[PDB]
Structures are given as C-alpha cells and as structure tokens.
C-alpha cells in the first residue's frame, strides 16, 4: 500500500473546481494507482493562503511528521497567494518596487522545508518521492507578472535534486490554455486544469518506486 | 487496503482539534488499521454548515458515488447545526414544535441516505460498514436540549441494524465530561472529544470485516 | 469611544486590496469617527470561506462575545463562497440543480446569528448596531449567477429590523461598476469596491449613536 | 482614546493560540486598558514569514505610516522565522556563520525600522513607546540554537532607550517552561505562552504615557 501526503494552499485544496470535485491532488492520486499497479492511502494538509513558513513549522507536529515519515510521495504547493496580493498592491499603488519577497522569502523556506523532510526520513531512505509545483500566469496580459512568476521559477528549479525532489513546470502547463484550464474566478485552475497538473506530475516519473 | 470514506459536517471536519490536528475520522482510521493489521485509505467529504439534505444529495455525485461504492466502511454525521438554529429559534418564539419538525428532517434525511447507499453498491457487496453518530448535548444546563436531543436519539436508534449498520452513542460519551471534551467554542469538540469518539467507534466492532 | 466589532468573510479580510490595504471594514472606521466625531475601537473576526454556521458557533467563545457585547456597531459579511463553489459544481457539470442550500442554510444561520447577539447584548439594549451586507453578482454574463444572488438578496431583507439591524444593498453598489470595482481576481472587490462598501454602510445610518 | 498598532510575523498574528483566539497583542491591549484605565484602538498588520526587511519595508506605505504617526504604542516581532531556516542550512552544512549573518541582517532591519518611526513622527511626538520582544529558544535541547538566540538577544538589547524604548526578554518567558508555553507545532506558542507575553510587555511599564 502507497502512502501519498500532499501539501500547501488553495492549488492543494483544490479551490476553482467547486466543492468536493476532484482537484489535481485527487487526481494525481488515480494516476498513481493506474502506473504503480497499487493501492495508495491519501492524507491532505491545505489551507488558502497557507504560508510556506506555516509548512515549516507544521512539520513539527506530532501526526503531520508521522504522515510525513511514511509518505512515499509528497506535493507542495504554496507562495501562489503571495504574489497575488503582491500585484493587488501594485494594482493600487502602481509601485513596481512593492515589499514583496516571494522569491527571496519563500524559495528559503521551501530549502528548509526539504531539510526537515530529509531529516524525519532519515538519510538512510532514498526511496521516497517530492514533487514541488511552480506557478502558472492567470494574468498573461499583465507583463509584470509574468516577470515575476518566471523569475520565482526559475529560482524554484535550483532546488531539484532529480529524481527524488523534482521541479513540476506548472508554468507550461497553463501557457496558452488560460481560458480552457481556469476556473470563473480566473485565478484558481478549473477542473480542466487540475486535470492537467496531475498529467504533469505523472509525466515527472516515480523514481525508484517503480 | 480498506477503504474508509467519511461524510458529515464539521464534526467529520475536525473542528475544535485545532487545524490539522487530527480528528474523530483519523484517529478512527488508525485503530481500525490497528484492529485489522492492514491499511486503510481515507477519503474525507465534508465542510462545516452541511445539513442532511445537503449530503444525501451527495451521494448522486459521480466522483462520491465512486468513493463510496468502494468504501469498506462508511461513517455519517449531520444535524448538529439544527440543534443550534432550534435553540435559537426557541429563544424568540418559544415554540417547542420548531425542533421536532427540524429532527423529524435530519431523520428522514438518515434513511434516506441509507436507503442509497445500498441502491449504490447493490446486492453483491453486502460486507460494507456503516457507523453513523448521534447528537451530544453541548448544553447540559438546558434540559430542554437535552429533552430534544435524546428524543432524536432514540428515534435515530430505529435505523439501526447491527452490526452493518450501528448507530454511536457520541451522547454518552459526551455526557458529564462536556468541561473536557468541548472545544473553545463550547459546541465543537476537543482533541480528547475527538479522541474519545474515535474510541467509541473502534469499541463498536467490524462486523463481516474481522 | 466607540467599539466596532467586524465579523465575516473574505471580504471583511479585505481579499483583493492588496497586504494590509484598507478594505471596507477600515474605511467603514474612519467614516465613523469622521460623522459621530468619536474615536472608534475596532476588532476583526474572519476567514477565507468562514461558513455561516461557524460564526454562529464563534459567538460561544468567551474572548468572541466580549467584544460582541461592547460592540457598538457590528458588520458581517458570509455566504459569498458558498454560491461560487456551487457555480464551480455547476460549471463543471451543467446541472442547474446543485446541493447547494445557500438561501436555505445560510440565512437560517444569519437570523440564529442576530439572536445570539441580542442574547449576548441583554433585551435591555437597544442602541447596538448591526449591518449585514449581501452578495454583488461578479459574473454578470452568468445569468444562473444572477438568479442565484438575486434570490438570496430577497430573503436576506426580511431580516431587517431597522434602525438596528439594517441589510446593506451590496448589489447595488456593484451592479454597472463590476470591472471598476473588482480585483484582478474579478471574485474580490478592488480597493475602488471597498471603498463604494464603506459609503452604503454610511448610507444606511447610525440610529441611536446620534 | 489611545491607539495601539502592532507590526511583525506569526506571532503578532497569534498563531498556535488557536484560531480567533486571543494572541499576546490583544492581551497586551487590555491589560494596557487596565493599567492606564482608557479605552484603546488596535490595529495590527502581520502575516506568517513576514521577515524583518519586509516590515521595515512597509513602513513607506501611507496607510500603515498613518497607524504608525498616530501610534501611542508600538509593539514589533520578527527574525523567528530566520531561525527556522538557519537550523535547518546549518543542518546540511555545518557552517556556523549562517545564521549570524541572517541575525545581522535582522539587527539592522530592527535600528532601520526605529529609526525610520522617528522620522514619520518627527520631534514634537516623543511621548511615542516601542516595545520589540526578543526572541525565545523552542529547541532547548539544541546548544547551538541556544547559542545562536542569546548572541542576537544581548546585541538586540544594543537598540533599548528606555523607558520610550524598550526590548522584551521573551527568552526569559519561556525558559525552561517551553512544554507549556509552546503550541503543538512546537515552534509557535500556546495560549499560556502567550498570556506570559502579554504579562512581560505590562511589566515593563508605559514611560511617559503614565
Ligand atoms: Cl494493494
Ligand atoms: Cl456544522
Ligand atoms: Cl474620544
Ligand atoms: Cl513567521
């Protein structure tokens, strides 16, 4: 039996698609069951607007750490919400300097986060599996977003350690399919794209599950 | 691998735990793998503010047929919301009507909920588990929350047929130690009411299953 | 001094203005102290996607009803997360007809909301203030959308027992001005919506505070 | 009326007391009431991995320098989260140096956002007071931890003017208290925690305010 902990904000919980309809992380589940051959035993800590720091210091409580331990796939999203109000604060100021340090302040915390993982793991393990989605542009009209979300990716794929820790490109999966992969509220993925980071996340291979 | 899918309201949520901090559902899911040694795959269909009517029209959706078609073992909560909403309609009208038709609702939506469980799974599978929980009183002082919920609780007792179908007493669990097992909000439960419900639940057997 | 208690939603959060932007519960502040020529006192209470249901349990919490039984003047905004998941649902499998309940089981939630205030308050009170918004329609082109947030406003009036309790027409406010005072997001109103919030909530008058 | 704005991370937000209860800011806020018997307005802006260049940062933005001019006490937190990410670097290199040049960055930002307070009041306001909390050690057991926490506090406390300025000996708080004082996620504190905060920032008297 696999053992699949998925973590971090809105894209995590699966926001845009509606209630109770299966998000990417349900998704990426059934693909895992249809490749591997094996049952898999979900668990799901999300919340909108969770912050990458809160991930930090959540690894740290007793039954999240436990799930973590047993995990053999892991999945973060996080720091889409941070950007977000970042351009809504340049939306009012029309400041391009805003205090925002998502590549600075989060990409860090996403380094402690692998730590933390490795050290509930244990050195001695190198079979388990981390998969780390980037961020997609809802505002491809707007160029200082796209600048932005393309710079914290391309500091987000320093992180990779192939084919453990793997980078998801998230970016390309929404690129010229906003319309058809976004939910009414534009920002959140719709089903169809939730549909579509799960194909993402299968296309980045399974390691030494296999 | 077994299986578990959980349906309800906030108690299903785990609300009053604290966030993340596992609930009556987990806890139940680990001495279930415990008392079975074999391990259990968790799917969790909940949000607070569902009534009955609300999940029993759950239950036509194609991805939540799907889980519980496949659930092993299947756990309900509702109608705790109605109670509060009863006792604040009580307050201003002091109609003691307004609750009896309220409970006479949740019950129906009970039975109806059941009566599709098995029009899901059909006549082949009849080794699926049902463990609905009823009402505790979070109010020990007012005797007539305590009248109104033990009146629904003797009639939520009806649709029991063990050991499928048992119906948890979460009243007696609950009754004298509501200073312990209420959250903050002196209606949700704690980390130890959660706990002692989950115990509940595994004192209530596994019928076909063991 | 004065004491204003704010309760609700994404919206009273301020979701959309930006980081610590001012939404319409801070810029609701300043025009009171501006027209009662008094200092105000303000305390927030919200979450993204707080159910209805949760606040009415909120009320029991010890730290909650001591600033709701000060509260001079109380906002509350809810349910407008519960139409876009059900919108969600329903642009992912064009059924008109959904599990939602949100004229059902939010507004019964609103009027054992406004009872557990005048039980908190003391039926002596009369001179508290409380104003509930309802929902702007941010999909104009959706005709179901219209329909949906059409109806709740309908029911959502008959709790209005004014002076005290007021319901604001947050639709009109929006209704011909959506791109102007909308967010990015296009769900969130703009810093410019928030602004329009706050001057209806002026409109609807302070009673007995005079 | 007096007005009390609060700036900093996690813990002006309250985290690990539970959502919606109150954290060590409003728990300052009324034994402020009590001691100096009047009224005070709250305002906070915080948000979890907020580091200390950002909060030095949004002292520019004019709504946040409208809270800070009219600020009678001003109460900053910060460089928790540092520490988190250098225990976890430290972790996979060794180096020694890692976090004292992190602590260095966070000493700066700390004299650059004081000063910069005096220059949005200027020199008719220097009735203003400033209490910044040092930080605790939620690892006891860790030497280098305690090490690296007590060489940023003695250079934190290179910044106090009392009584206008004054540093917080929050590692004095928790010492030796930290299964208590601390939250589940063990890094964030408890409700207990944080009234022992509040408790320590009323110990430290008011100046020239009393
Ligand atoms: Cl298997
Ligand atoms: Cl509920
Ligand atoms: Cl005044
Ligand atoms: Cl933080």
Request: proline content about 3%; overall charge negative; hydrophobic content about 35%.
């Amino acid at each position: 039996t696999l053992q699949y902990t998925a973590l971090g904000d809105s894209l995590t919980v699966g926001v845009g698609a509606g209630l109770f309809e299966p998000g990417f992380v349900q998704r990426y589940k059934r693909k895992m069951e249809e490749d591997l051959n094996e049952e898999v035993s979900l668990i799901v800590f999300a919340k909108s607007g969770l912050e990458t720091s809160e991930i930090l210091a959540m690894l740290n409580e007793p039954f999240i750490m436990e799930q973590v331990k047993k995990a053999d796939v892991i999945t973060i999203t996080g720091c889409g919400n941070d950007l977000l109000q970042s351009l809504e604060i340049y939306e009012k100021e029309k400041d391009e300097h805003v205090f925002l340090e998502a590549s600075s302040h989060c990409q860090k915390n996403y380094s402690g986060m692998l730590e933390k993982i490795r050290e509930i793991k244990g050195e001695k393990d190198t079979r388990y599996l981390v998969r780390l989605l980037n961020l997609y542009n809802p505002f491809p009209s707007i160029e200082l977003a796209d600048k932005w979300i393309s710079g914290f990716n391309r500091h987000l794929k320093q992180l990779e350690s192939a084919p453990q820790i793997k980078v998801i490109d998230t970016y390309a999966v929404f690129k010229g399919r906003e319309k058809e992969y976004l939910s009414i509220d534009r920002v959140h993925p719709s089903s169809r794209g939730y549909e579509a980071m799960s194909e993402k996340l299968r296309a980045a291979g399974y390691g030494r599950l296999e």
